Amino acid sequence: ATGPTADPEKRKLIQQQLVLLLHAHKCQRREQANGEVRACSLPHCRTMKNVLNHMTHCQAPKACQVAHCASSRQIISHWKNCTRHDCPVCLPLKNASDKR
Ligand SMILES: [Zn+2]
Ligand SMILES: [Zn+2]
Ligand SMILES: [Zn+2]
């Protein structure tokens, strides 16, 4: 559920979806900044980049009930609404972005 779900697979999958969505945005700009040679090899990154491009073409986002897209928009909507200084996935990402 979108609620305080405690199921461990939900924990890892939801946090990985959000982290790879942000990686897909990052890595799309990074790739576009070169436009002639690749800069990534993470197996799931290309799938999430495709899901992100779909969310850009999409018109329902959340009601676009397809597992990957509906999930993608629910996690990124959480990240958009977030108060991030003390959240279970927010705090990790904040440490994962301490420098650039
Ligand atoms: Zn990547
Ligand atoms: Zn969609
Ligand atoms: Zn959060």
| CATH H-level, domain 1-100: superfamily | TAZ domain (1.20.1020.10)
The experimental method behind these coordinates is NMR
Whole-angstrom distance, CA of residue 48 vs CA of residue 37: 19
Which residue in the block uniquely carries the two structure tokens 């899901």?
A: 51
* Ligand number nearest to the C-alpha of 62: 2
DSSP string of 4-63? ----HHHHHHHHHHHHHHHHHHHHHHHHHTTSSS-----TTHHHHHHHHHHHHH-SSTTS
Burial class of 1 by CB neighbour count within 10 A (0 to 12, 13 to 18, 19+) = exposed
Query: So where are the chain's domains?
Result: 1-100
Q: How far is the CA of 66 from the centre of ligand 2 (A)?
A: 7
- Residue 27 known to bind ligand: yes
- Residue 25 known to bind ligand: no
Instruction: List the one residue out of 68, 89, 86, 69 whose CA is nearest residue 78.
Output: 89
- Residue 57 known to bind ligand: no
32 close to 47: Cβ distance less than 8 angstroms: no
